[PDB]
Amino acid sequence: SCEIVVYPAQDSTTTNIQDISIKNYFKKYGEISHFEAFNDPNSALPLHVYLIKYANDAAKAAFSAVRKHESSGCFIMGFKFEVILNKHSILNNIISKFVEINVKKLQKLQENLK
Numbered sequence: 641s642c643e644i645v646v647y648p649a650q651d652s653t654t655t656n657i658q659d660i661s662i663k664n665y666f667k668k669y670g671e672i673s674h675f676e677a678f679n680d681p682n683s684a685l686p687l688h689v690y691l692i693k694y695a696n697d698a699a700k701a702a703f704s705a706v707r708k709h710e711s712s713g714c715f716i717m718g719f720k721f722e723v724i725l726n727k728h729s730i731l732n733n734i735i736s737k738f739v740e741i742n743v744k745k746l747q748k749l750q751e752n753l754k
Contacts, residue, residue, distance in 0.1 A: 641703075641727075642694055642695075643692065643694070644666070644691075644694070644725065645689070645723070645724055645730060646666075646689065646722065646723045647687070647688065647721060647722055647734045647738070648689070648722070648738075649720035649721055650720065652745075653688060655717070657716065657717050657719055661717060662675075662677070662716055666705060669694070669701040670695050670701025670705070671695055673694055674691075675692050675693075677690050678691070680739050682739065682743075685742065687738040687739075702725060706723050706724055
């Protein structure tokens with residue numbers, strides 16, 4: 641009831657926000673037992689998708705994390721992320737996702753070579 645997954649609010653992104661910045665921001669909720677940032681295995685780009693596991697109110701950290709923000713959504717260096725509970729495997733699901741965003745950017749560079 642306890643890990644959080646953060647990933648970009650909008651399919652394409654330009655940032656080079658770095659882990660630290662994100663980890664901190666989430667620190668404001670809970671002592672962070674564990675924090676992972678994820679890369680596309682295929683191209684190595686950062687995906688800007690993190691698994692943060694908290695701390696009980698590990699769980700309440702977690703949920704507030706998901707929750708504090710829908711007033712405005714969650715911004716971190718004025719870059720907008722989504723944050724959700726890592727329940728039912730969505731972590732790998734968000735990763736997969738973004739791999740395929742990149743597979744698709746790659747697919748359209750590929751015809752750029754036409």
